[PDB]
């Protein structure tokens, strides 16, 4: 007749890591790392992204004739740009402050293209010959569609003076440019006037552009260049243009109607007619996990990114330090299904495994609260944001990279170290709960049984099946059976 | 006759937190998080801040007529600017490198304004007509006070050639500007010469400015603009000006006399006739706490800033795992008052509580060192710093924000998780102490007493007051009571 | 007859620190902090650094005559520049985008200088008179060696139009400049033409420079100035120059022939004819430690930098929580040399110390895995990178300093805290191992021996050497001796 104290065992092969031991097989564990993605671009909470295909942001905004698909865009959730878009600037040149514009686009969800300067507004200039073979449409020379390349009419280019007063209640993004002619003859053939300028003024802009007539290398078959500029025209302000040549004038502008969180994503994976709450450039995530290792650059409600390949929290015991688990109790009980700790009883009346629901719920509550506390502390982590730099901005670009990679390393260490330390603490917690139950039965039985040291108490007397129950309840009468044990001794 | 091992209990209501359990009621605790402020701006270590009221830094340095109170400014400890000061550049335009200038002022505590170019130096130019209705003073057109808007005199504007040599040993801040006229007629009416320039040279400066005569929107009633510039003139260098018009000459310049720690605080909170060692834009801090959650931007000897709402360290024990505290000892004793651990005796002469000074003093040292160690580990933390950016520096501004918020989240997690883990260890430390003291007494008594299971030992022999003390003294003589206890065992 | 449990003791004075206690003398300990350096500059894996001595990067690349030593530099590992080099721009002026050029250079291991435009390319210009006493050589006026200050010939300066196509298959760094003359007479005396320009154009570059003819302060005896500019001509692109004066033409250019890891170190420390794998501006490191506190800016396979003065890991035991070590055992054993824990026996055959191999090995494996896990987690620490900023870039310079200092503080805290926390656990780990060993012999001997409480068990029977061994072996035969012990009892 004997009562035993033991712990759960099963056939779980899930492993966890600790500071002192790797690949410790536990009865119960919880993965906290998401490692899977649907491999496709999806709508973000019902709203489709804007996929520019082979067109860049500059080709869309200025109206590269190969980008007609986006002459009018519905509202987007985010913008997808392929890494090296073919249709960028059909006519060689530049777009000033291009990275500051992209940063501004990242906080905009909808444009409305409005005509602000009709071509009828230029009665004394030519508005139909401003085309180039560098900007082909259907094999024929063309140009950007949102601006107009004005040239001379009847061998004259009168001085332009025009003002647009923004009458909408939303800000307007407006683009214009300057053409850099190739030589003094071409300068005259196009604009007649040999010494030209472009003036642009608002309440804050005070720009003067002068053509640079020089020899340059051919790009897209052209030695000329076009330098484009942009501004944000505030609701009740006006923009004033003055030019005697080389003016690429605004025709259409963009009314910024919806502002909100967005990003310009560099991805080439295809749209998949799906919805998600979390998008990465490699694919969407559907997960309640607190961590993921898919990609740093995400948008939406996402898990926290880590470079970890494994993040598994030990919730259960060591499968088959305080000296109980794998100590004087050498192995787990597979026949014990309910509860994490309990007793095995043996007498003439019967035999069976009985769980200690009191000690078990204490352990489940603590183990569960630890998992919740761990998840809660990682709500506020560093999240990378898309910042673009140009070729003479390589120091701040490198500072950016080192900062974003720095924080990511800090949080990767924080997540992996916390799991290791608390896994160790959790295993030691189960070991302590078993010994406290072994000491609960002891100091209650006393010399009514000999403690064999294997976790069992060999009763010198005999126990009813209800006798074993009373100790499991926590109340047991030592004097009632004190007499039978003395005779059994010797 | 018995002796019991037990621990402290009081009417404390303080709650601390651990990884497994929230809201644990302990007997003693140490809050480390200051959460209150006086809601006012104050002097810093006896030095008043420079409150610019509604004047910008630009308005003070150039000398907006609305800023005349700041003509002579005493030494300051920090500068207070409203978020949108209304007295800023009364004549529209810009101040070049204004954020870089604000950055220099953050390391400056006092200027000495000096007259470097008197109006008598302009005998062939008009010095009393450079006024505008955009810069009103007392119901008449006026102008910035520290610069001079020079005009043609007798319908002439002879070329200016002037040098100022810094003969002071202090660095000199000098400001000048250019006026952009509105059309060719106004250019003649103001400065007879139609084609003008400003040249400015030092040992490192080589600047040429040319007015931009174009049409702009009216701001503060003016379609003109004034662009201002600045430089620091080293102690033996000279600045050389040449101009045939549109020149806004210096008159007064600022000698940097005191360099040190200061900040451009942004706040509209009022001055409260107070002194502090620690100042935030929402209020001043008077605390010895190691942490605060008032505001990231502080100046002076301040606590470390965290986003936490609660940061309370456990120092005492759980109020009313090794298995003693709330284990076989069901609860603490209110009647034990001079220590955390001790004994309760009961004999024929009476009863009473006694604290074990040895074990309580060891636990006090360990708990105090843990508190001190945690404060010391938090000595070096991220300190947010005011850095300013303009409308086309939003990428770097966004970089700055994410870095300062990212370090804040890292150190907030560190503070909170360390308090959680160390609070758990502290409670288990108290529980272990009590078990080791229980075993210490169990070691002396052996079979001369009985282990009840609740922390008490029922003596088999008679133990008077001197014998009770010997068990507390650690000098219990077992052989002196051997036979009586053996007789009582029957 | 008697068997004791106890633990190792030695003559160690090594001390570790814990959260609750500092300066704990432990039996064995592992330093993880490197604190020493040879105070010299060395080759990096057999490659000698480029030591510019008193020449700046600008003086080297432009070819300041006082830098001739660096006319043909072999491949380097890192570049060493003094903090304030004396031979910088001998003719005063600037090098544009200098900090960005230094950032490109920090990723370059070898230049091959080539002659791209020889002086024969200038038949109608004077090529021997472009010298200055600001750039002495051998007591006579000279000039930068890689660039040609062209001058009028026969009182004429024909317009220069030249193109260079990069026919090499590697990137080409090209430099050029513009001379700002001092007045209209000097302009004519040097270039005949009063109104001059320089145009430069590539596939991406479209630059126009115009002399600024103004009064400036004398620097190195010159009121004039030279502004220099650079570009990277890609392997099949062309650069086009046009000018009618003030042009400082390229002569030699630098082919980028090896790209690689490198850095521009600021140091006055001497080369010492040494080799290293890890270099620091104050000295070289020869070390296998995982952490060092020498300097944040290193190059090579280096330890991770912290601000700590001490980082020592407890690997062994407290020297002479669970209540065994310095508890009921109360002291270590000097006679016990072959393990951390074990037994001292005493019988009629003699006495002697013996170690428990199993419990010692289990502790050796755990502590070794602890040390390795701590080192492994700190492999991805922040690595500071040298980044230079000019006088009007003080905001981003401060942002940079704060970021690198903030990560340094974060990772210093992580190291000190993890060493503190794991040290405390390790000492407890040993305490628990001793107790579990003590309780292993207990529960096996049972009432066949008496429990002294000082760690020893007094046998009530005769335990010969094999009986003593069976206790260490775990094969004690309880029934064989039971009657002899009950006979000795009472
Ligand atoms: C072109 C030139 O040498 N100008 C010097 C000027 O000579 C003029 C003369 O050519 C003309 O015929 O007559 C007028 C008067 O009607 C002038 O006399 O005379 C100045 C003084 O009167 C010179 O200034 C002295 O220049 C010094 C520096 O000498 C160097 C130098 O070492 O940098 C001499 C070099 O040969 C010369 N470089 C070249 C390529 O010709 C340079 C060059 O002139 C400057 O670097 C360009 O700014 O100057 C000292 O600066 C001294 O203080 C100053 O008086 C004119 O240099
Ligand atoms: C009007 C015209 O065609 N003038 C002759 C040039 O065509 C010719 O230079 C050639 O130009 C080629 C590109 O031709 C376009 C273009 O960019 O596609 C055609 C456009 O009609 C024209 N646009 C305007 C407003 O005139 C455009 C324009 O002239 C340039 O873009 C201005 O920079 O050129 C191609 O580049 C060839 O390589 C080139 O030879 C020149 C020289 O032969 O003579 C002109 O009469
Ligand atoms: C063209 C000209 O030189 N003068 C007269 C115009 O100034 C005037 O335009 C009006 O000017 C108004 C503001 O008038 C001031 C001002 O800024 O307050 C008055 C100043 O005395 C004058 N300053 C100087 C130094 O001469 C100032 C100055 O001309 C401008 O700043 C130069 O930019 O103008 C106000 O803006 C009105 O809305 C504007 O019409 C016209 C019309 O009255 O007559 C001109 O002769
Ligand atoms: C821990 O203690 C705090 C109270 O000090 C509890 O916070 C309040 O809980 C009630 C609902 O139970 C809310 O209505 C209050 O708004 C909470 N905040 C207060 C009073 O400041 C908290 O819920 C407790 N947490 C647990 C797990 O028991
Ligand atoms: C500003 O004033 C000082 C004092 O006159 C000038 O420095 C002196 O210049 C003269 C002639 O060049 C020398 O003889 C003195 O030895 C110089 N004294 C000192 C302390 O430098 C200085 O040249 C002037 N600064 C400028 C840019 O002209
Ligand atoms: C832990 O388990 C995985 C998969 O079985 C294995 O790849 C890995 O090598 C194991 N780690 C160790 C230390 O054995
Ligand atoms: C644009 O029109 C509105 C309405 O009259 C007017 O208030 C405003 O001043 C105009 N803005 C400019 C820059 O002319
Ligand atoms: C607890 O006891 C102290 C002293 O008796 C008393 O000052 C205090 O008010 C009490 N606190 C509470 C919450 O009752
Ligand atoms: C401590 O013991 C070791 C073993 O011989 C010895 O090498 C060392 O020098 C000793 N140190 C002192 C201070 O005795
Ligand atoms: C620890 O040891 C060092 C060197 O012996 C000593 O400087 C320091 O004062 C000691 N610290 C404490 C708390 O005793
Ligand atoms: C340089 O020479 C090659 C020869 O193939 C030519 O293809 C190339 O276009 C030239 N580069 C320029 C900018 O003309």
Automatic annotation (TrEMBL), chains A, B, C:
Please name the GO terms that the record assigns under molecular function: host cell surface receptor binding
Cell compartment(s), UniProt: Host apical cell membrane; Virion membrane
Q: Which cysteines are joined by disulfide bonds?
A: 4-456, 42-274, 55-67, 90-135, 278-302, 463-467
Membrane-topology annotation of the record: Single-pass type I membrane protein
Highest classification ranks of the organism: Viruses, Riboviria, Orthornavirae, Negarnaviricota, Polyploviricotina
**What Gene3D superfamilies does the database record attribute to this sequence?**
3.90.20.10, 3.90.209.20, Hemagglutinin Chain A, Domain 2 (2.10.77.10)
Record's superkingdom? Viruses
- Name its GO BP terms in alphabetical order: clathrin-dependent endocytosis of virus by host cell; fusion of virus membrane with host endosome membrane; fusion of virus membrane with host plasma membrane; viral budding from plasma membrane; virion attachment to host cell
Q: Main role?
A: Binds to sialic acid-containing receptors on the cell surface, bringing about the attachment of the virus particle to the cell. This attachment induces virion internalization either through clathrin-dependent endocytosis or through clathrin- and caveolin-independent pathway. Plays a major role in the determination of host range restriction and virulence. Class I viral fusion protein. Responsible for penetration of the virus into the cell cytoplasm by mediating the fusion of the membrane of the endocytosed virus particle with the endosomal membrane.
Name the Pfam families on file: Hemagglutinin
Presence of the UniProt keyword Kinase in the record: no
Q: Which UniProt keywords apply?
A: Clathrin- and caveolin-independent endocytosis of virus by host, Clathrin-mediated endocytosis of virus by host, Coiled coil, Disulfide bond, Fusion of virus membrane with host endosomal membrane, Fusion of virus membrane with host membrane, Glycoprotein, Hemagglutinin, Host cell membrane, Host membrane, Host-virus interaction, Lipoprotein, Membrane, Palmitate, Signal, Transmembrane, Transmembrane helix, Viral attachment to host cell, Viral envelope protein, Viral penetration into host cytoplasm, Virion, Virus endocytosis by host, Virus entry into host cell
Carbohydrate-modified residues? 10-11, 23, 165, 286, 473
Q: Tell me which family the UniProt entry assigns to this protein.
A: Belongs to the influenza viruses hemagglutinin family.
* Quaternary structure and interacting proteins, as annotated: Homotrimer of disulfide-linked HA1-HA2.
Q: What's the source species for this entry? A: Influenza A virus
> Which GO terms of the cellular component aspect does the record hold?
host cell plasma membrane; membrane; viral envelope; virion membrane
Chief subcellular location equals host cell
The record's section on InterPro entries has: Capsid_hemagglutn (IPR008980), Hemagglutn_HA1_a/b_dom_sf (IPR013828), Hemagglutn_influenz_A (IPR000149), Hemagglutn_influenz_A/B (IPR001364)
Coiled coil regions, renumbered to chain? 375-409
Q: How is it modified after translation?
A: In natural infection, inactive HA is matured into HA1 and HA2 outside the cell by one or more trypsin-like, arginine-specific endoprotease secreted by the bronchial epithelial cells. One identified protease that may be involved in this process is secreted in lungs by club cells. Palmitoylated.
Protein name listed in UniProt: Hemagglutinin
């Amino acid at each position: 007749d004997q009562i035993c104290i033991g712990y759960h065992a099963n056939n779980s092969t899930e492993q966890v890591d600790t500071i002192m031991e790797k690949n410790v097989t536990v009865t119960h564990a919880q993965d906290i790392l998401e490692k899977t993605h649907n491999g496709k671009l999806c709508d973000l909470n019902g709203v489709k992204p804007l996929i520019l295909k082979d067109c860049s942001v500059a080709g869309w905004l200025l109206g590269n004739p190969m980008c007609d698909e986006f002459i009018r865009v519905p509202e987007w959730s985010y913008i997808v740009e392929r890494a090296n878009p073919v249709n960028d600037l059909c006519y060689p040149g530049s777009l000033n402050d291009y990275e500051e514009l992209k940063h501004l686009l990242s906080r905009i969800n909808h444009f409305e293209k409005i005509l602000i300067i009709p071509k009828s507004s230029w009665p004394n200039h030519e508005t139909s010959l401003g085309v180039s073979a560098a900007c082909p449409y259907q094999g024929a020379p063309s140009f950007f569609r949102n601006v107009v390349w004005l040239i001379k009419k009847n061998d004259a280019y009168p001085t332009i003076k025009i003002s647009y007063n923004n009458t909408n209640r939303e800000d307007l993004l407006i683009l214009w440019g300057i053409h850099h002619s190739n030589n003094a003859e071409e300068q005259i053939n196009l604009y007649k006037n040999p010494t030209t300028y472009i003036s642009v003024g608002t309440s804050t802009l005070n720009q003067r552009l002068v053509p640079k007539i020089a020899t340059r290398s051919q790009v897209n078959g052209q030695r000329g260049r076009m330098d484009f500029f942009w501004t944000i025209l505030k609701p009740d302000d006006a923009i004033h243009f003055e030019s005697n040549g080389n003016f690429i004038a605004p025709e259409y502008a963009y009314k910024i109607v919806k502002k909100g969180d967005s990003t310009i994503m560099k991805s080439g994976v295809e749209y998949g007619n799906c919805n998600t709450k979390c998008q990465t450039p490699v694919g969407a995530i559907n997960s309640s996990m607190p961590f993921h290792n898919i990609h740093p650059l995400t948008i939406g409600e996402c898990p926290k990114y880590v470079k970890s390949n494994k993040l598994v929290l030990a919730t259960g015991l060591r499968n088959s330090l305080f000296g109980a688990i794998a100590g004087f109790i050498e192995g787990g009980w597979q026949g014990m299904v309910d509860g994490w700790y309990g007793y095995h009883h043996s007498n003439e009346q019967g035999s069976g495994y009985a769980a200690d629901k009191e000690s078990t719920q204490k352990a489940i509550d603590g183990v569960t609260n630890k998992v919740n506390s761990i998840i809660d502390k990682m709500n506020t982590q560093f999240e990378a944001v898309g910042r673009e730099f140009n070729n003479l901005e390589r120091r701040i670009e490198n500072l950016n990279k080192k900062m974003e990679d720095g924080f990511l390393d800090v949080w990767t260490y924080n997540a992996e170290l916390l799991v290791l330390m608390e896994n160790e603490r959790t295993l030691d917690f189960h070991d302590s709960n078993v010994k406290n139950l072994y000491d609960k039965v002891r100091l209650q039985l006393r010399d009514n049984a000999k403690e064999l040291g294997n976790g069992c108490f060999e009763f010198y007397h005999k126990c009813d099946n209800e006798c074993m129950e009373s100790v499991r309840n926590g109340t047991y009468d030592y004097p009632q059976y004190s007499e039978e044990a003395r005779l059994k001794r010797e």
